């Protein structure tokens, strides 16, 4: 039995005002292409994150 | 045996020692040192019997 | 309390040797040299004199009834 703790390295709660902001610079390259498809984006999205 | 233990300690000092997949570094080091000391007692003890 | 009369091992007399043993110690003689003078060749008898304690000395300090 393995939990997320044993497989996770670090976690943080970042703030992004708009969905396209992605204040984190490193992940901006890959999140953009994935987020192009409006999956769950039919309405407003909270500016919080649980990366 | 004493020199071998120092060599094992030196390997762990420099991070050269690699832990076994079934154990951690701290426990693995305690296992390797124990065998060296345990083996010496048995080998020396066996020679005493002869 | 006091030196035994004779060696417990063989039976050689050792009580009489105690008086001479102490006298020889104060005469600059070595602990083992005194035993040879008294004539204790066996190590069993030398034990009775070399490592003996005379407790009666301290008991005699107390006054009697």
């Amino acid at each position: 039995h393995t939990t997320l703790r044993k497989v996770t390295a670090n976690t943080a709660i970042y703030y992004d005002p708009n969905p396209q902001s992605t204040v984190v610079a490193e992940d901006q390259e890959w999140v953009n292409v994935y987020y192009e498809m409006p999956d769950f984006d039919v309405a407003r999205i909270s500016p919080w994150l649980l990366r | 045996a004493k020199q071998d233990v120092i060599e094992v300690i030196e390997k762990a000092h420099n991070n050269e020692l690699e832990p076994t997949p079934g154990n951690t570094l701290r426990q693995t080091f305690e296992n390797q040192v124990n065998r060296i000391l345990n083996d010496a007692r048995d080998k020396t003890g066996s020679s005493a019997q002869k | 309390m006091i030196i035994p009369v004779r060696c417990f091992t063989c039976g050689k007399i050792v009580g009489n040797k105690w008086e001479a043993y102490l006298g020889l110690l104060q005469a600059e003689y070595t602990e083992g040299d005194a035993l040879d003078a008294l004539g204790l060749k066996r190590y069993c008898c030398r034990r009775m004199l070399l490592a003996h304690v005379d407790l009666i000395e301290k008991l005699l300090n107390y006054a009697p009834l």
Partner: protein, 1023 residues
């Protein structure tokens, strides 16, 4: 110049000789009692609350000073005749001294006229006096004077005589006070414990403990999970756990930033900051200080009916009940908060893992309570009750309007009987109080052997209750090195709970921290109240008896100055210890009593401070006005406690630190005088304990106490229920250097024996031994036995009373069939009469409403001759007598004999000299033991001791039994033996007594020291 290694062996033992000559073996017992009777008793009286009586007429009674006189005996005449310690034992009365207190009363009757009267030396009561103490009658007396008083000069004293019974206060280890400890328990609902029991100086109020716990992450909730882990602190008088943050608000730090300032010293570090964030959420709603005080008082033990009362109760609890040691006044809010923040800060380090959890078994975290500290707590019980008795007695008098005489108010029985009760039965406290008592302390002193008596006085007890239960007192810890003997421990279920103090180690008597506190002020030390919290980030914390004195800018310079003062016997006493926690920037100074520490040679720049000149003066220690205290004055040797030993480097011997091919450690701070001092009284007498197995060394500690021998010199004068004295107690052929200090050489408890290890006739199994009948007939192991019978004729009832007279068959109606010719006209058997079987030795009858015989017969059927008869008057004044029956026990097949190490062996069979296996020279071994014991339940030291004994006897020199002396070796001993025409290994050709043909195997024979154990067949069968 310097001590050469070839001379260090003799030099090291010389300094140890001076240490015991000046300090002694019972210095820890006497010192604590001296402190208790000199300052603690005065402090209790001085610190007593004022006595107030009201019902216009106001009476204020205060105790000015306490006067203590030397022990005296008060008979019916009442004259203050001196009471010798020996007289107390014979008369079966407590050895104690009167206690006198000055009482000054001020009375005002609302007439604007204040007048007072002086009561000089009010007979408050009496205090038992430890023997050989400052107030004892045998202090500073020469050996000649002690004999005149029928007291053994070699007896170290250090015990209390209660009702004729010698009692020793067993030291009880307790968790150290004014110290912060963080422990991890998996059973509690919270992850970590911020336990810190805080108490003022010696004791002004009962100890109060607060646990600043931290809730575990295991629990899950809507809001609990979000904040996660929060700190909760439980107050001593608050049933529920209140957040720690709210406490600071109650102190006065309303601002939230101030809370973080006191807890978090390093704002740059964010790891600790995040941990404190959740704790603020619970306390956030409480912003005002008054609300915080209201919040705490809500869950108080006795909440007030009105709202304002809740604030007052919380104010008193935090000010007085909480953290009494840091501050007791009303202007210590800043000081109290800083200590509270430190406890949280200590918790944060442990929670993050950057600080190792405190060790439960660490002796630095445990304090030892001796007769002084123990009796100090007891004295408060009676004194507090004494005020109540005065108050209650005066209460009925005051309301009536008439003055009350003090003579009736003060109760002597409570003070006298209160201390005497527990010291006799062993149950501490007050049996009236509805709580569980403390048994096992103030035990009957073991006078079977001198070594046993010394061990009992230095005996230690592990903590009981939650502290002991949680920890592992039985297991041997590393801190015991040089402080508590590892080998010595009773065998059984209570194994490791009871231990013995190390020979050189002693427990700090105690001192006032005021001189140390004043020292810091004149230096760069700055108090917390002056500095801002930001200055604590870089500076080092200074602690004095657990108090927050204040940080210091430079730790290195202050400690070097502090160390110099300690070595110079300046205002800082050598007893005081300073601890430098470098990894935590904490400097801890402890001055309270109960700290176990041992002397250590100081090493500077890899060079001993002890030079040849110091040893030269010690060699002439007599008639030169030079003692051990001078060594500490010169700074060559100081004392290191467990906490300071944590950060102090040690060297086994100078040879280790002088030079090495590869430098193991180039910075040595202290050097041990000799490692053998770790052994206790019973372990010290064992040669080659290193060669011996650990259980065998522990086993000997029990056997050594059970060994029979001369316990003291003044045995004839005293009367003891059990006392075994050996016919010929002979000092061993193989003796240890430490044996001299124990005085076991003067009073040994065994007789040497030429032991041949062979299986003769198969009459000795693993647990057995074969003796020589002829040797016993010459006095090989014979010993005397003394049993004291006591009886008193008291007028308990007016109609019926006891009397001493011959129970004649006619005048007496009820009697038991026995011979009564032994009794004399006075009903007491005169000395010199042989008594055997069931015989009356003292005549006593009761005049029931014709008299019924109630005499005392012999306890057993052993045949003995009465030695001496004593007739006295008990404390009640009734006639009281004691008689000692002396019997001679000849060793037989049932007696149990035990070597100095190994399991005791019963005498399987006794053989005459002819039947014993004689050697070529005609030396029949006195004792034959089973060779099959040596492998497992015995040690090679027996063979080595035999080899040393043979060389010692042959060469006429007492062998050295130092455990760690490289000079003595098995090969070296063998070479010496070969020079005297003997086998190098000690083997000899033994001719069998029955058949003269040579035995094929060459037996190993040597003079091994042996001792006779108290366990004898005659006692069991005669019962």
């Amino acid at each position: 110049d310097e001590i050469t290694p070839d001379l260090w062996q003799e030099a090291c033992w010389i300094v140890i000789s001076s240490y015991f000559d000046e300090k002694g073996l019972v210095r820890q017992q006497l010192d604590s009692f001296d402190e208790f009777i000199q300052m603690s008793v005065q402090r209790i009286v001085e610190d007593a609350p004022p006595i107030d009586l009201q019902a216009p007429p106001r009476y204020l009674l205060k105790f000015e000073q306490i006067y203590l006189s030397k022990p005296t005996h008060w008979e019916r005449d009442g004259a203050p005749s001196p009471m010798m310690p020996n007289e107390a034992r014979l008369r079966n009365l407590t050895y104690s001294a009167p206690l006198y207190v000055d009482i000054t009363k001020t009375v005002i009757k609302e007439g604007e006229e204040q007048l007072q009267t002086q009561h000089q030396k009010t007979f408050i009561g009496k205090i038992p006096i430890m023997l050989r103490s400052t107030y004892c009658l045998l202090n500073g007396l020469t050996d000649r004077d002690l004999c005149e008083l029928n007291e053994c000069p070699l007896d170290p004293g250090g015990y209390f005589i209660i009702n004729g019974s010698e009692k020793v206060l067993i030291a009880q280890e307790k968790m150290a006070t004014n110290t912060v400890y963080v422990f991890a328990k998996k059973d509690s609902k919270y992850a970590y414990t911020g336990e810190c029991r805080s108490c003022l100086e010696n004791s002004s109020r009962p100890t109060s403990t607060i646990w600043v716990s931290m809730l575990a992450r295991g629990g899950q909730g809507a809001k609990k999970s979000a904040i996660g882990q929060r700190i909760v602190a439980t107050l001593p008088y608050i049933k529920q756990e209140v957040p720690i943050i709210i406490v600071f608000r109650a102190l006065g730090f309303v601002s939230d930033r101030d809370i973080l300032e006191h807890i978090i010293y390093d704002f740059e570090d964010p790891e600790m900051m995040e941990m404190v964030k959740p704790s603020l959420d619970e306390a956030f709603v409480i912003q005002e200080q008054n609300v915080a005080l209201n919040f705490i008082g809500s869950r108080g033990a006795k909440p007030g009916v009105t709202k304002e009362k809740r604030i007052k109760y919380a104010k008193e609890v935090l000010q007085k009940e909480m953290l009494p040691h840091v501050g007791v006044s009303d202007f210590c809010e800043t000081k109290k908060a800083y200590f509270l923040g430190y406890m949280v800060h200590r918790l944060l380090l442990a929670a993050l893992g950057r600080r190792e959890l405190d060790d439960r078994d660490h002796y630095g975290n445990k304090r030892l309570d001796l007769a002084g500290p123990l009796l100090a707590f007891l004295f408060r019980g009676m004194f507090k009750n004494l005020l109540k008795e005065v108050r209650i007695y005066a209460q009925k008098f005051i309301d009536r309007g008439k003055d009350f005489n003090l003579e009736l108010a003060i109760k002597t029985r409570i003070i006298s009987d209160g201390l005497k009760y527990s010291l006799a039965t062993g149950n501490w406290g007050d049996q009236k109080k509805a709580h569980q008592a403390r048994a096992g302390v103030s035990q009957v002193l073991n006078r079977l052997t001198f070594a046993s008596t010394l061990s009992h006085l230095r005996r230690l007890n592990s903590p009981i209750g939650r502290d002991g239960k949680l920890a592992k007192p039985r297991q041997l810890h590393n801190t015991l090195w040089g402080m508590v003997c590892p080998a010595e421990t009773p065998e059984g279920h209570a194994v490791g709970l009871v231990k013995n103090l190390a020979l050189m180690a002693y427990i700090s008597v105690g001192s006032q921290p005021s001189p140390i506190l004043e020292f810091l002020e004149e230096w760069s030390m700055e108090n917390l109240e002056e500095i801002s919290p930001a200055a604590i980030a870089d500076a080092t914390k200074i602690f004095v008896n657990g108090c927050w004195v204040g940080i210091h800018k430079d730790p290195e310079q202050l400690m070097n100055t502090l160390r110099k003062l300690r070595r110079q016997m300046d205002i800082i006493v050598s007893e005081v210890s300073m601890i430098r926690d470098i990894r935590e920037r904490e400097i801890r100074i402890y001055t309270d009593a109960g700290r176990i520490c041992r002397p250590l040679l100081i090493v500077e720049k890899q060079k001993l401070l002890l030079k040849k000149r110091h040893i030269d003066q010690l060699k002439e220690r007599e008639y030169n006005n030079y003692s051990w205290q001078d060594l500490v004055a010169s700074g060559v040797v100081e004392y290191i406690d467990t906490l300071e030993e944590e950060t102090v480097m040690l060297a086994m011997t100078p040879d280790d630190l002088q030079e090495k091919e590869v430098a193991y450690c180039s910075t040595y701070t202290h050097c041990e005088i000799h490692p053998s001092m770790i052994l206790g009284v019973c372990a010290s007498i064992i040669p080659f304990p290193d060669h011996n197995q650990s259980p065998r060394n522990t086993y000997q500690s029990a056997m050594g106490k059970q060994a029979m021998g001369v316990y003291i010199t003044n045995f004839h004068v005293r009367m003891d229920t059990l006392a075994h004295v050996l016919y010929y107690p002979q000092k061993p052929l193989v003796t240890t250097r430490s044996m001299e200090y124990l005085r076991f050489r003067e009073l040994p408890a065994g007789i040497n024996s030429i032991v041949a290890i062979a299986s003769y006739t198969g009459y000795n199994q693993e647990d057995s031994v074969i003796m020589n009948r002829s040797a016993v007939d010459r006095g090989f192991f014979r010993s005397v036995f003394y049993r004291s019978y006591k009886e008193q004729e008291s007028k308990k009832g007016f109609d019926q009373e006891e009397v001493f007279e011959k129970p004649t068959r006619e005048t007496c109606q009820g009697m038991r069939h026995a011979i009564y010719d032994k009794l004399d006209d006075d009903g007491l058997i005169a000395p010199g009469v042989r008594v055997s079987g069931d015989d009356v030795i003292i005549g006593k009858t009761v005049t029931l409403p014709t008299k019924r015989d109630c005499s005392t017969f012999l306890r057993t059927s052993e045949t003995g001759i009465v030695d001496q008869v004593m007739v006295t008057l008990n404390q009640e004044g009734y006639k009281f007598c004691k008689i000692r029956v002396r019997s001679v026990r000849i060793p037989q097949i049932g007696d149990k004999f035990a070597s100095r190490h190994g399991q005791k062996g019963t005498c399987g069979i006794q053989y005459r000299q002819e039947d014993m296996p004689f050697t070529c020279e005609g030396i029949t071994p006195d004792i034959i033991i089973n060779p099959h014991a040596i492998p497992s339940r015995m040690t090679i030291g027996h063979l080595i001791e035999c080899l040393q004994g043979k060389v010692s006897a042959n060469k006429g020199e007492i062998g050295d039994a130092t455990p760690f002396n490289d000079a003595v070796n098995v090969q070296k001993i063998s070479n010496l033996l070969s020079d005297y025409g003997y086998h190098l290994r000690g083997n000899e050709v033994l001719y069998n007594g029955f058949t003269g043909r040579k035995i094929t195997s060459q037996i190993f024979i040597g003079p091994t020291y042996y001792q006779r154990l108290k366990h004898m067949v005659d006692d069991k069968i005669h019962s």
